[PDB]
Design an enzyme around this catalytic site. Sequence first.
Site, PDB file in Angstrom:
ATOM      1  N   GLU A   1       0.817  -1.207   0.000  1.00 27.86           N
ATOM      2  CA  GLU A   1       0.000   0.000   0.000  1.00 27.86           C
ATOM      3  C   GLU A   1       0.856   1.265   0.000  1.00 27.86           C
ATOM      4  O   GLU A   1       0.415   2.311  -0.488  1.00 27.86           O
ATOM      5  CB  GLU A   1      -0.951  -0.014   1.197  1.00 27.86           C
ATOM      6  CG  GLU A   1      -1.964  -1.158   1.195  1.00 27.86           C
ATOM      7  CD  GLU A   1      -3.126  -0.942   0.236  1.00 27.86           C
ATOM      8  OE1 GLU A   1      -2.891  -0.557  -0.929  1.00 27.86           O
ATOM      9  OE2 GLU A   1      -4.283  -1.161   0.651  1.00 27.86           O
TER      10      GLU A   1
ATOM     11  N   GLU B   1      -4.995   5.025   0.641  1.00 32.14           N
ATOM     12  CA  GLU B   1      -3.958   4.007   0.732  1.00 32.14           C
ATOM     13  C   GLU B   1      -2.936   4.342   1.816  1.00 32.14           C
ATOM     14  O   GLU B   1      -2.323   3.433   2.385  1.00 32.14           O
ATOM     15  CB  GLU B   1      -3.291   3.809  -0.629  1.00 32.14           C
ATOM     16  CG  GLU B   1      -4.235   3.460  -1.781  1.00 32.14           C
ATOM     17  CD  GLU B   1      -4.792   2.044  -1.721  1.00 32.14           C
ATOM     18  OE1 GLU B   1      -4.825   1.440  -0.631  1.00 32.14           O
ATOM     19  OE2 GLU B   1      -5.201   1.531  -2.785  1.00 32.14           O
TER      20      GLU B   1
ATOM     21  N   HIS C   1      -4.484   2.832   4.611  1.00 32.00           N
ATOM     22  CA  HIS C   1      -4.266   1.389   4.549  1.00 32.00           C
ATOM     23  C   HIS C   1      -2.894   1.007   5.095  1.00 32.00           C
ATOM     24  O   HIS C   1      -2.762   0.033   5.850  1.00 32.00           O
ATOM     25  CB  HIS C   1      -4.419   0.899   3.109  1.00 32.00           C
ATOM     26  CG  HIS C   1      -5.802   1.058   2.560  1.00 32.00           C
ATOM     27  ND1 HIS C   1      -6.115   0.787   1.245  1.00 32.00           N
ATOM     28  CD2 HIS C   1      -6.955   1.459   3.147  1.00 32.00           C
ATOM     29  CE1 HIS C   1      -7.400   1.016   1.046  1.00 32.00           C
ATOM     30  NE2 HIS C   1      -7.933   1.424   2.183  1.00 32.00           N
TER      31      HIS C   1
ATOM     32  N   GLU D   1      -7.068  -4.290  -7.587  1.00 30.25           N
ATOM     33  CA  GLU D   1      -8.445  -4.068  -7.072  1.00 30.25           C
ATOM     34  C   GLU D   1      -9.396  -5.142  -7.599  1.00 30.25           C
ATOM     35  O   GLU D   1     -10.193  -5.657  -6.796  1.00 30.25           O
ATOM     36  CB  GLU D   1      -8.939  -2.685  -7.500  1.00 30.25           C
ATOM     37  CG  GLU D   1      -8.805  -1.625  -6.421  1.00 30.25           C
ATOM     38  CD  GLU D   1      -7.394  -1.120  -6.167  1.00 30.25           C
ATOM     39  OE1 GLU D   1      -7.251  -0.086  -5.481  1.00 30.25           O
ATOM     40  OE2 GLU D   1      -6.441  -1.761  -6.646  1.00 30.25           O
TER      41      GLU D   1
ATOM     42  N   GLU E   1     -11.639   0.466  -0.861  1.00 27.14           N
ATOM     43  CA  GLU E   1     -11.302  -0.246  -2.089  1.00 27.14           C
ATOM     44  C   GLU E   1     -12.446  -0.203  -3.093  1.00 27.14           C
ATOM     45  O   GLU E   1     -12.211  -0.257  -4.305  1.00 27.14           O
ATOM     46  CB  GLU E   1     -10.926  -1.694  -1.770  1.00 27.14           C
ATOM     47  CG  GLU E   1      -9.521  -1.864  -1.207  1.00 27.14           C
ATOM     48  CD  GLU E   1      -8.450  -1.272  -2.104  1.00 27.14           C
ATOM     49  OE1 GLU E   1      -8.593  -1.361  -3.341  1.00 27.14           O
ATOM     50  OE2 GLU E   1      -7.466  -0.716  -1.571  1.00 27.14           O
TER      51      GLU E   1
ATOM     52  N   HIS F   1     -11.927   2.901  -4.801  1.00 28.01           N
ATOM     53  CA  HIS F   1     -10.795   2.673  -5.696  1.00 28.01           C
ATOM     54  C   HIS F   1     -11.245   2.002  -6.989  1.00 28.01           C
ATOM     55  O   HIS F   1     -10.785   2.352  -8.079  1.00 28.01           O
ATOM     56  CB  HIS F   1      -9.731   1.828  -4.994  1.00 28.01           C
ATOM     57  CG  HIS F   1      -9.194   2.450  -3.743  1.00 28.01           C
ATOM     58  ND1 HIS F   1      -8.312   1.798  -2.909  1.00 28.01           N
ATOM     59  CD2 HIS F   1      -9.399   3.671  -3.192  1.00 28.01           C
ATOM     60  CE1 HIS F   1      -8.006   2.585  -1.893  1.00 28.01           C
ATOM     61  NE2 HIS F   1      -8.652   3.727  -2.042  1.00 28.01           N
TER      62      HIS F   1
END
Lengths: 510, 510, 385, 385, 159
Positions: free
Chosen positions: A99, A129, A132, A194, A228, A231
């Site tokens: 990440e 991220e 993350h 992803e 996500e 994302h």
Amino acid sequence: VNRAPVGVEPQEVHKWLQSFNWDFKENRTKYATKYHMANQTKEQFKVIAKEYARMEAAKDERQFGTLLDGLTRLGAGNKVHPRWGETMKVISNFLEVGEYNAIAASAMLWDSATAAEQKNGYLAQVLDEIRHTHQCAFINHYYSKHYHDPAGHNDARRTRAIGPLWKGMKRVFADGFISGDAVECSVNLQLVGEACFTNPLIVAVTEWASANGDEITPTVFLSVETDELRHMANGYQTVVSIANDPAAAKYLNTDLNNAFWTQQKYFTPALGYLFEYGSKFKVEPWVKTWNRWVYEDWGGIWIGRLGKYGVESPRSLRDAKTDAYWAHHDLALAAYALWPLGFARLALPDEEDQEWFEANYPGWADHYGKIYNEWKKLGYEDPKSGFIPYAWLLANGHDVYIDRVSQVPFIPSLAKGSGSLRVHEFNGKKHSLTDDWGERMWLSEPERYECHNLFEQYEGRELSEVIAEGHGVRSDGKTLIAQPHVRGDNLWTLEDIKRAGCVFPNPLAK
Amino acid sequence: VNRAPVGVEPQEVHKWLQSFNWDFKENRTKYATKYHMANQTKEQFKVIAKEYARMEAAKDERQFGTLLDGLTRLGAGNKVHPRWGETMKVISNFLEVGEYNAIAASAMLWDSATAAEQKNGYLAQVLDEIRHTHQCAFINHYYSKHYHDPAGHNDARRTRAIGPLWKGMKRVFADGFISGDAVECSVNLQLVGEACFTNPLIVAVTEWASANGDEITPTVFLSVETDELRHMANGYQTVVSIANDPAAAKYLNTDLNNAFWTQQKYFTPALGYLFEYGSKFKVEPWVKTWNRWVYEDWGGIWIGRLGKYGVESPRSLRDAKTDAYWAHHDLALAAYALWPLGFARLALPDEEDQEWFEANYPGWADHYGKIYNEWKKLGYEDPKSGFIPYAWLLANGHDVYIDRVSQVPFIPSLAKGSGSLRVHEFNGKKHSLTDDWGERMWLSEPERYECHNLFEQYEGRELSEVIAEGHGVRSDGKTLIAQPHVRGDNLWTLEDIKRAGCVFPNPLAK
Amino acid sequence: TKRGLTDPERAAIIAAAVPDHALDTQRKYHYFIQPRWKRLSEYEQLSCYAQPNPDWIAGGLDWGDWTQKFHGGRPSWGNESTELRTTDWYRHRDPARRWHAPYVKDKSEEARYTQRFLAAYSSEGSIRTIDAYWRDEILNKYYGALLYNEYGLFNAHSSVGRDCLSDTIRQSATFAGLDKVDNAQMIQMERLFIAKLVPGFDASTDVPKKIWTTDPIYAGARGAVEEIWQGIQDWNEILWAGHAVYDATFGQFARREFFQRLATVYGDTLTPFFTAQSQTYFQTTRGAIEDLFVYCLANDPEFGAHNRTFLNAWTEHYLARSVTALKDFVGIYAKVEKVAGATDRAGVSEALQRVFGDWKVDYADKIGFNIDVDQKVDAVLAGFK
Amino acid sequence: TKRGLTDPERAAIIAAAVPDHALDTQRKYHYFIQPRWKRLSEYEQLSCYAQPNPDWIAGGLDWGDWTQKFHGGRPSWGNESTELRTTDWYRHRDPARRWHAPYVKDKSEEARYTQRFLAAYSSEGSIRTIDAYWRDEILNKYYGALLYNEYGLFNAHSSVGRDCLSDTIRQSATFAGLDKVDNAQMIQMERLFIAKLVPGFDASTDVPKKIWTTDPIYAGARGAVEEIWQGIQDWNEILWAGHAVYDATFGQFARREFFQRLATVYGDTLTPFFTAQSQTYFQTTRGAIEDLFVYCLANDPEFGAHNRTFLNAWTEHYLARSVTALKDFVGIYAKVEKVAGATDRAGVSEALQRVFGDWKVDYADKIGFNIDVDQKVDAVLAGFK
Amino acid sequence: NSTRTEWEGKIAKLNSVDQATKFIQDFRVAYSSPFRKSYDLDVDYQYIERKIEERLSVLKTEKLSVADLVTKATTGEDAAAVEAAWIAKMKAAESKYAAERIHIEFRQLYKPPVLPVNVFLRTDAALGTILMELRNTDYYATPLEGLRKERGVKVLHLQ
Ligand SMILES: [Fe+3]
Ligand SMILES: [Fe+3]
Ligand SMILES: [Fe+3]
Ligand SMILES: [Fe+3]
């Protein structure tokens, strides 16, 4: 003059964000690129910094409060299977750097983004991220603070370089996203992960952690999946933007195949090992879930959403599944051989594990089960035995060569999956190639890949000396970070490694 | 002009808070009082509204995040013993109104407070107990949303009036804190509870909930205890302030004895029933923990801290322990008799429970165990039996009379504890007194206590009609909120109550 | 569909398998990290060493060349991107210990409080006492031009993020960029709210765009921002120019002096909220950036002056650029109607002296740059009429 | 020392004991509560009906007389404490759905943001551009007098808390009192910060105490506050006088007009933060109080005018009191040095007209009070010199 | 490492800017590129490269002025001249192998601190764009053995 209570909404701010840009000649993408996305590009999510901050802060506190009260009150940190403790250790260690290079690559995207709305979406990606990364680091921190094996998490960053799988994870997430060209980086850093990997990877980690009995990871991973989803939406929108480009139809499919193959070649065996061989309680065979997540619910929807724009599905999947049917087991043999290099503690599969593997994987027994059995009976766990699996492999004529492109450990004689060994000579240096696509990639772009094989890195270096100089010793100074046994008794000492006397022979040099 | 980054601290604000007051003649305590505390009074905690808000908000989110993520992910709401589900139902229902009348009484204190620092401490007390009310209500809300028996929590406030124990809890916390004079209210609302009851009550609830297997309550109760420590400090400071008053030495000891006796007379049997008879997994006998918490770690420290100021320990404790040795069992018999009036579902003690009681309480078997046995064999659980324990008690000559002062159910013939029945005639109305202190209190102050016994409230009213008009029916409209059995089968119906035909006979009217 | 912790036999197996004794004595996370403060901070405990750096990168724990470089010979994260050199890139620590969680908390604070107070202000209708000329001309036309400057700085930080040679530095740069962009959003949202209250106000960005592009007042600022975007690739140079010198001269003077004082003395009360938010954001960013440069680069025991000489050259060039931008910008003072105190020449010179003196004592004394405020302020004021 | 959920055999016993099927279909908490909005709000779900009221209290679910009354015949929570009568006391719902958790969150927001911005302002040193006369005289002397007014209102709410006949009403009153006291704390903390920055400033409360006690400027305000404390026991009267009429006239005029506009036009920028905080707090309190009175009491289908006639009388008396207080207070305008716009008589009359017009359209039209702003503003302005 | 010690030690003798430039240049040519003269000093060449980077930087700014620091290469060539020369060379490089050769040798010749950082990154971006448009094309079509023969690589073991 009106005096009614009026509260402004982020919708108008986002609407004007598109017009925030002003146009002039010298503005250009700082990094090299062959694609230029449309100057105007709509985003699925109407997100401002303030709304994003509120949305992230609510869930962030929620999860920190949960972990800081309920998990420590129940004492769930200690009530985990140590095998899964090591597995989550390595998972967190690898995903944090994944990440981090994700924020780096998304920063590249935002640098190479013309649309202001797309720039804001990329900035939201960067911050998400970053979150993350910090959540993965916090999982490692809590495991170090509460779990009974702190060593692997305490020196997670310092001892990461010693392991062989670290180079492969570097190639797939660390250098897999920032090294490419900006558009290509997007699909590898975003779409390839992803869709084909990150979406499924998470749900699988939550489910398997629930099965094994650790509630620390699920919450964080679900919170990550929340971002996500955004994302994914941003990826789809940016691929829509990159379409209608004359150069896109000439290189986009090639870049997609490159990214997919490069990600899968190491991703599949890595998880396969970390799930099947890293847990006591298994919910479902890894081959079936890998196939399902990578193909059935990824290719259909994404080709439906992209082929309208002129995107061709990679044909490497037919070889990818044939590889995947045994790549995890091949990497399992390699990792059990090279356990002293890695930081995580490992346990050889037990009789129930062996019968589970044979029932789910036909022909697993006659290939791997005995190899593990003679490893066990030759004092694998016993420190007084002084047995090194790599020494046995060298004595038995089975010698491991890592790929130059993907840096995945590979045994040619003991692998049932597809792919073959290839040795190449170029200006006095030998090179090891394990796949035809990797061979082509290295051949066209020799300057692309210059990664130093650990075999010549440790040539002339005793294994115990390498461990000691690499901070691979425990805090006490007498035992190793990794152990051949998941049990907390008869931990191996560096003097046992010295007695074993393993010396790296440069297998590629032959 | 300096430009260094300077951050202000609440210490200076609190220091000037003492000087915030300005003095003039007409300012006086609005409520009746005989004590006036010192105009200057220091507080142990240097607390401002902003610092208090930050401290409360951090823990509040923390606990809400924990409950909203971890508890619902583990599904711990359903994984509780239903007996303890009903017990926590009634505990939350009673403590929410207790803390509400606590904020009312603390508002009275703050109205009758001269010192600005003491006023701020009282305001912090008010806000903290408001938090406590909302946390108890939120525990009820989560139990209604997730626990498998929602009915008791759904209509917790509406059906609370039907139960007989509700009058006693009203007398001890609801009207026990606001009805007195402002100083007296303080010790009952604060010192009598915080020290002798609330401090221990919490730790016991957490421990017993951990034993039974509900993690929802502990977190909230610990968060409450965090503020309860500040409540203790504020109590000690306000008692220090109320000292040095000439009238204090004349009435403070009497008020202390009044508050202690009034609180214990119902507090002891209530918890005793709700702990010993409301759980399957018992950690420690309730008589021992009650004695320890009420005397050993309360009287010593508080008399050490107060007798220097001229405070005498109440001598009612010698009678209090003799009462407590069987008061919980007496109230247990009364509650098992009057189960249809209460909302909570109850289960008669089992053979393991009976032997546990006999081992911990000598002579428990020959007094209560058979009574429960013939209750069980007379179709206690069976709806088709049509058996009412009150009807059996009337047929057996054992008739229950509630006190006029404390409104605690009391059986004279079936009680082994101290205390006796007293019946008094005053202007054509009979009155029931169960204790000498209660008799004295009622005699001196007849206008103080006018609570209407439920027996004359329901005189001429069939029990099923009372339940129906009191919203004591379930949501379906055919079954009762409470059940004779903790099991989820053969739930009693209102038609069964109609077949039983219990009619309130006015036992005091005799 | 069964959890390991809740299930009875599964939990029994787990409890049987778990060892009785802890294997490692110390529970500390990343004890080997050298803490700047007395104790290892939790921000240091997480953020530091998150970057895998090979040994040929300063302070690199990892070994070996990059496993996949850029196309061509250039490495993915080589030290050729920066012009400054340091003994170790991980020495930088944010003075606020500000990792993602506290930063996002505080940013959600700003959002929530801004919304609440904004609704309260709308309910009170305090806007009607504002000066008609002030809110009609100055804010609508020129306050939307500073929007574009903030957005320009924000998109400018696009490279530092990717070409950062460390991790705490990258986090600080990303947070500073977020501060720039949400300051721009605050300006736009304030304009929208003003349009919402009083009818006839122009909420469109066309007028701010015309002011930012075709108006000579902001020509210097536009040129400086455009030179900041793609003029210099070096991420250290981008950070220095866009945070210390150009920012704390031009943007600091603008926001702190003009759009705050002239707003106050004109009966405006909505603008000071947004100016205060921007000022706090700049204060945090300036603290982080000055800590970076002074502690690591300006006082490096080895590279020493080498790193400084470079900072001196960058400071000279971008200080000249910012002085030109300020001289071109100051014409707004003649644009606005005359008021005693701030508007007249003496007050303007005093404000410039204050700005340059604080900038000097904050940066130049530590770096070693020699600046005399008199000639600077005279050069800037020469453009004032 | 073993938890029920974690232990294997204990969890097995619990799982064996728990029934398979849910006993009640509906999971809704307190479904019988009538929701003011379309759906039962979570604030309504918790706060409402938390008060046990016997049947002889309006909208009382419980039955029977109080189990322990005050000494004498007076009940603990009888309806004799209030003079107004309503069909049910639980009909009141706060328009913000503000129970303890969101309120304390927002209050910690105010604390954290105030501290951050305050530190940033200290770092920037923007105080030095403030007017010397303004911060030297007006704030130090008279801004500390409004401290005592806010504290007086705060301690005034001591009774409503205890004598409240409902639960949402009690929560709203407690929150309003907390707003008053922390506004006072904001004033004191601003004075402390100003003392911290500039040397020689007087942070002591002796001068504000002298201004509040022996100075004729605040004599009317002091008299009104003292009459508010112990003059009236009725909690409804306390809420009305100290929140709608006296507050929104005197304190609203002061904070919104004088200590905000004159602060702005004098180069002050620190004060607008605290004035905005106080204004938001007052906006929330005013919304809650007007919702209470208008929805429940002013438009009760049964009590109707009875409740209103009483509100009309209270409004008349306390409006006269507040007009006298404002007339005595306005002398600060002559105390401060003359400035065009706000200070001169025309601006003062326009400000008074705005204040009284908004107060009228907010309260008097709904209640039915008949007020013409011209005579009011003339009476208040007669004390201005 | 002994080799690293020896190399650092012999770096200490570099007291001349031009001599240091020649040393870094020929060291890069010898040991840095994938096209290399000898692999004996592999693995440890990156650390020595960083050390000589630092030492050359230290020698830089000792006598060099700001104007040359900002717009003049260490060898003495103008930044814009380097720009134009290398872009013109890339334009005339029709072969992908020739293109990669010339790109790599340009990186050998002029990279920091030999060249100013900003102009160097601009050259890298332009060269990368040209090389991506010129090499990414038709990667799948040419046969593996075609790549093997064109690269000039000799295979030892295949199975
Ligand atoms: Fe992610
Ligand atoms: Fe992602
Ligand atoms: Fe409490
Ligand atoms: Fe308390």
